[PDB]
Amino acid sequence: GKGGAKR
Amino acid sequence: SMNPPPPETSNPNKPKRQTNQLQYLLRVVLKTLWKHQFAWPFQQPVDAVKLNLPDYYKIIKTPMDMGTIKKRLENNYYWNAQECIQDFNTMFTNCYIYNKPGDDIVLMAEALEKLFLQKINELPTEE
Ligand code: NA
Ligand code: NA
Numbered sequence: 001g002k003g004g005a006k007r
Numbered sequence: 008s009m010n011p012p013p014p015e016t017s018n019p020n021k022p023k024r025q026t027n028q029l030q031y032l033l034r035v036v037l038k039t040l041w042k043h044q045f046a047w048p049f050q051q052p053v054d055a056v057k058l059n060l061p062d063y064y065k066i067i068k069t070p071m072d073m074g075t076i077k078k079r080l081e082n083n084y085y086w087n088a089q090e091c092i093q094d095f096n097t098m099f100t101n102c103y104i105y106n107k108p109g110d111d112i113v114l115m116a117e118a119l120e121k122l123f124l125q126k127i128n129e130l131p132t133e134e
Binding site: 001 | 045048058060105106107110111112114115
């Protein structure tokens, strides 16, 4: 998955 | 590593139409989600090369994104609203399949989807 922090 | 070719946005054999509902999908629904602060991960096809996601297109065989949807709507690629709604649904579903609950991307998809559902709840008739 794309687990990185984005928000 | 390689990305697949993106989903077509134009097709010279596919009948084209603009309905009042499709107009709404571009001008109200896509516009509202596009402007949203969480829109950016969804504004273009997932770049598995750049994001180093070598399994992305092993898992996701029907990719979809709002850039593609936007161009389809601009090109009158769709015959009906339901085709366009399906594409939005596919985009969200892919995100939920590929990623995990609690991932920011999922939180992002969920907020956009709630707004999408709010906007499509009030699709106009071909009045
Ligand atoms: Na194609
Ligand atoms: Na209209």
